[PDB]
């Protein structure tokens, strides 16, 4: 809420205060790395704002890294796969998602989530990215 | 003010600084746990939703001196008993306690058969909230798999069960993302309002639960009291005293 309040102050503001790609990453990151109640709905709505603001904001490597981190953590895998496929198109790829194994490494979770869900075909694709 | 009373100076601060009497408050040590009526009899019952048992079973477990089987699953048990028993087991009163001796029988007594709100509290503690989400989801998924049944009454109940499962898993998903334990719905300590907020109606309620609870201690601290018909008598009443103290209209 501390980060989201700053986002609202600039989302509903002047043109030079309008959020950019970097801004959306921080707000999503705050909700993903939350030690509190469920935040998956807020991330989806926050993502909904970014896609609506497509004429100005385009996602980057860090954007899909958090979305894959968020969706895998909240057990929603089908949407995690979609962003991982877009994540593979970047040269940094899984290394950004790895985050040096910090924050209870999400890169391992995506591999582990696919294994438990049985989505092996997507799992071998993930190994190709690594 | 009498010592250790509802207006005791030691518990609630000096009578005449004296302003602390509005804030400092005491508690009541209940010998038996008591269900919070806000989550038991206020339909829909959160305890009933969480335990998946119908409200009628829970009502009889705390008011109709029923007994419940397998309250605890996290510990080994050796019995074929399944769930709520509206009738007292004949072998459970003179055969099993004699075989395992009274001292050894009470060690695992609550592990096999529990009665009153203690059965609910232990059952709530034993709940595997992760498992509750998993099996409710597949059960909910299974119900919609069949689809229409061609009968209005059957389709009426399939909607109720599906909404019950969704409400159940939603309750479970909230518990593990917060620091609220479901055992707290069955309180073993009763907070007392500060004396200033209750000057001399609810005081007689507080004195009602206190003396009812104290006489229950006399029915347990004594050497080999008569169990059952006497232990339950001032165990359901103490439930009622806390009941009317918290919510009386329900």
């Amino acid at each position: 809420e501390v980060a989201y309040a700053t986002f609202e102050n600039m989302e509903y503001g002047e043109d030079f205060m309008k959020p950019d790609t970097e801004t959306y990453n921080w707000v999503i990151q705050a909700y993903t790395r939350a030690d509190s109640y469920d935040r998956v709905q807020d991330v989806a709505e926050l993502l909904g704002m970014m896609v609506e603001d497509y004429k100005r904001v385009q996602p980057n490597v860090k954007t899909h890294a958090l979305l894959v981190e968020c969706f895998t953590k909240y057990c929603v895998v089908k949407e995690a796969i979609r962003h991982f496929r877009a994540l593979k198109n970047f040269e940094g790829g899984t290394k950004v998602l790895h985050n040096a194994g910090n924050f209870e490494d999400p890169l391992s979770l995506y591999l582990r989530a696919l294994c438990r869900e049985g989505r092996i075909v997507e799992l071998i694709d993930a190994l190709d990215a690594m | 003010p009498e010592k250790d009373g509802l207006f005791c100076e030691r518990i609630f601060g000096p009578i005449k600084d004296s302003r602390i009497r509005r804030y400092q408050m005491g508690y009541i040590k209940l010998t038996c746990p008591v269900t919070h009526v806000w989550y038991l009899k206020r339909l829909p019952s959160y305890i009933a939703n969480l335990l998946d048992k119908p409200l009628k079973e829970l009502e009889g477990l705390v008011y109709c001196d029923f007994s419940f089987a397998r309250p605890i699953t996290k510990k080994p048990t050796f019995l074929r008993l399944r769930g709520s028993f509206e009738y007292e087991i004949q072998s459970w009163k003179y055969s099993i306690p004699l075989f395992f001796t009274t001292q050894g029988f009470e060690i695992f007594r609550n592990r096999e058969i529990s009665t009153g709100a203690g059965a609910i509290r232990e059952q709530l503690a034993d709940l595997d909230l992760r498992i509750i989400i998993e099996n409710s989801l597949v059960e909910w998924k299974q119900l919609g798999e069949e689809g229409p049944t061609g009968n209005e009454w059957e389709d009426r109940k399939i909607v109720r069960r599906k909404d019950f499962l969704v409400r159940r898993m939603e309750l479970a998903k909230h518990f593990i993302r917060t620091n609220i334990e479901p055992e707290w719905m069955v309180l073993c300590l009763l907070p007392v309002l500060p004396p200033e907020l209750r000057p001399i109606d609810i005081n007689e309620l507080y004195r009602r639960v206190i003396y009812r609870n104290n006489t229950l201690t006399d029915l347990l601290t004594t050497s080999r009291s008569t169990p059952g018909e006497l232990v339950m008598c001032q165990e359901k009443l103490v439930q009622e005293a806390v009941d009317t103290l918290l919510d009386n209209g329900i």
């Binding site: - | 397998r70 699953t73 996290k74 510990k75 080994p76 048990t77 050796f78 019995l79 074929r80 008993l81 399944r82 028993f85 009738y87 087991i89 004949q90 072998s91 055969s95 099993i96 004699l98 075989f99 395992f100 001796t101 050894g104 060690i107 695992f108």
Partner: protein
């Protein structure tokens, strides 16, 4: 350093005045000691006894000297004066290999030396052999005192050479019919063992409550000792027959039921394995085992115990032996690792009220609470089955946390057999762990 001269001076060489009998070996020391003590009791001789299980100073009356491993050497001779002060005539004690090696028994005037057997499963290999030989190296007198050896042990020839070669020797063994005492005919039963032994004086018949051939050595030693002291054959029968239950050493507790109950002190993988196959030779219908492990100690043996028990025994009952500060369920979880099970998996079967049998077809029923476990195993025995408890033996205390709650397995089995019939007459089906009450399902 050595000192202890005052110990033999204040006592005035108390061991010399009395008759001291030494029994040494890896297995069957305690059982032999009771047989010898009852054999000396049967002859009218006052008996002194200092085994590990108890410290009988005379007859039946007990005492509570500090039983902390080997007592102090000066302290050891102190009560030897005390028993002699009351007038004790005969003395017998387990010649522990560490006790005489440490020099605790330095001024003890031993009279009869008995070598049960050497297996070395308890370090050195040949130094351990001569460490036990110091008991026979004490034997200087060649004409008065006596030696007793067991030929079946290959080390007997080594032991007999020790000390004075001229000492008379009485030889006992199951095989080597050339032995002085050998079993002509022996029968093994779940409640008694009957053996016909050919003593040099004549054929002798015995029938005692000691079960299994592992104690026939003790029975053969007991009669052989009687021959060494020249005991009459009839009196030897009374002494052997009198002893029927040594506390914690394969003790049979029989409250006139259809299947015996065995209480044993085995807690090691070797001791349990040796015991379980030593009861299969008794030809029982089934074997039921109750085995526990101590908490926070020798945790590397817990999976081994379950693996041995589940193979030798048809039904196994894992329990908490001495949880201490460790969680009793955690100890059982280490046990289940031996079979690949987990406590979580076991409790899942508990929900279904059906515990699947093992790969070999055996049953595994665990319960953390000790009192409700030993009693439960007793009710699980049919006609011809055999129930054995392990890990406690004679130790009458259950170490929970830091408190040593008084718990004796003998009382548990005694009471369980008393009320098991009432459980069956009430319709309770105590055949498998999920008991089927009349109101069930």
């Amino acid at each position: 350093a050595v000192l202890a001269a005052l110990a033999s001076s204040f006592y005035r060489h108390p061991s010399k005045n009395m008759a001291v009998i030494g029994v040494t070996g890896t297995n069957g020391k305690t059982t032999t000691t009771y047989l010898i003590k009852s054999l000396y009791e049967a002859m009218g001789v006052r008996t002194g006894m200092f085994s590990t299980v108890s410290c009988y100073v005379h007859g039946d009356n007990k005492m509570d000297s500090p039983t902390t491993t080997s007592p102090d050497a000066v302290l050891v001779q102190s009560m030897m004066a005390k028993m002699l002060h009351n007038g004790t005539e005969a003395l017998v004690m387990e010649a522990s290999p560490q006790e005489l090696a440490s020099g605790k028994c330095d001024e003890v005037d031993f009279d009869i030396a008995v070598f049960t057997n050497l297996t070395r499963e308890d370090g050195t290999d040949e130094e351990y052999r001569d460490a036990e030989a110091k008991l026979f190296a004490r034997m200087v007198d060649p004409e008065r005192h006596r030696k007793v050896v067991n030929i079946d042990d290959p080390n007997a020839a080594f032991f007999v050479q020790q000390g004075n070669p001229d000492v008379p020797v009485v030889t006992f063994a199951m095989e080597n019919t050339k032995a002085d005492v050998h079993p002509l005919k022996f029968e093994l039963s779940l409640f008694e063992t009957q053996v016909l032994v050919n003593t040099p004086q004549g054929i002798l018949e015995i029938s005692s409550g000691l079960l299994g051939r592992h104690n026939i050595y003790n029975i053969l030693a007991a009669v052989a000792v009687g021959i060494a002291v020249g005991a009459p054959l009839e009196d030897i029968v009374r002494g052997v027959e009198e002893v029927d239950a040594v506390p914690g050493r394969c003790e049979l507790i029989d409250e006139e039921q259809a299947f015996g109950v065995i209480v044993d002190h085995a807690n090691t993988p070797d001791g349990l394995s040796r015991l379980l196959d030593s009861v299969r030779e008794l030809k029982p219908r089934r074997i039921i085992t109750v085995i526990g492990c101590a908490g926070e100690n020798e945790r590397g043996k817990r999976p081994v115990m379950t693996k041995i028990a589940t193979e030798k025994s048809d039904v196994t009952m894992l329990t908490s032996d001495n949880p201490g500060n460790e969680d009793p369920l955690d100890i059982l979880d280490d046990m289940l690792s031996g079979i690949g099970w987990t406590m979580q998996e076991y409790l899942k079967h508990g929900e279904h009220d059906y515990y699947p049998p093992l790969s070999n077809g055996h049953r595994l029923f665990l319960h953390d609470v000790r009192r409700v476990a030993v009693r439960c195993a007793v009710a699980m025995g049919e006609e011809g089955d055999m129930v054995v408890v392990a890990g406690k033996g004679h130790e009458s205390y259950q170490l929970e946390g830091d408190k040593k709650e008084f718990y004796d397995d003998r009382e548990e089995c005694r009471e369980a057999l008393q009320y098991v019939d009432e459980l069956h007459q009430a319709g309770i089906d105590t055949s498998e762990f999920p008991w089927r009450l009349p109101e069930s399902h």
